[PDB]
Structure 1
């Protein structure tokens, strides 16, 4: 989730083809490009007032949300700009006419403009492959009880 000072990286962070002319003096030192996510997901304020780049961001980045939309509790924040959801569910064993507690751990990419921690039930949506385990992107966040 955490982010640097903007340009920490050996390569220049910027958004693609978003150009601000040095011949034309401006107020905002850097043009910023955002987009509406869709599905009624409200691109939050931190998205438009930040300096962060994160091309994997659902807003401000080049990924797009399509496919399944999942909700789950956030069990590990420890990675950088990605986290781990624990989705819980109850599986049916027909012979015994009862259920068994199972679970699945989903890595998802948490854009800056979201500050997430363990607790923190999270909505997440299918973005296309990001890295090798990551198919989902943080979209909406709900609070923690503790």
Structure 2
């Protein structure tokens, strides 16, 4: 007669049970390896390059299989910065990079821009116009190759 946990109706509306692969949440005697403040079992990872782990990653409840902090996605390659351009998708944003291009013949500059598709973890809530830091990862979709690592307000 062991009373287990209950289904979290907030985060279970996807026709299949959302669960973290790295850990088993049905353990009667959890160890000290992966335990958050609430005493639950949650897998969290420490990425490199001196990036702090968000609080919602350590003591949250969301399930993301493409998050760089709570999944097997690793960060390697390039680190860039941009401004949020659109947040009309689900866990995806568009960032824009603006720069000046120098034309040698006329000795003058030229305004140019480029658009990138980035995966936004639920640990972050960026608004349009904010500045973000993104890091390169493996192909996560047809167009996505970067992951959000930090957000600067306004």
**Secondary structure of the corresponding residue to residue 57 of structure 2:** helix
Is residue 154 of structure 2 the alignment partner of residue 135 of structure 1?
no
**Secondary structure of the corresponding residue to residue 119 of structure 1:** coil
Q: Which residue of 2 aligns with 1:8?
A: 13
Greater RCO, CA 8 A, separation 6+: 1
1:42 corresponds, among 45, 52, 58, to 52
Deviation at 1:21, TM superposition (A): 3.5
Taking structure 1 as the reference length, the TM-score comes to: 0.89
Q: Which residue of 1 aligns with 2:133?
A: 123
The one-character-per-residue Cα deviations of 1:78-131 (angstroms, maximum 9, x if unpaired) are 111010001111111111111110000111001011011101100000011111
2:81 corresponds, among 68, 71, 88, to 71
Aligned partners of 1:53 and 1:61 also within 8 Å = no
2:67 corresponds, among 33, 57, 71, to 57
**Secondary structure of the corresponding residue to residue 97 of structure 2:** strand
Instruction: Please tell me the root mean square deviation across aligned C-alpha atoms, in Å.
Output: 2.0
Distance in structure 2 (CA, Å) of the matches to 1:86 and 1:58: 21
Number of residues of Structure 1 aligned to a counterpart in Structure 2: 141
Deviation at 1:20, TM superposition (A): 2.9
Deviation at 1:17, TM superposition (A): 3.9
Deviation at 1:5, TM superposition (A): 2.3
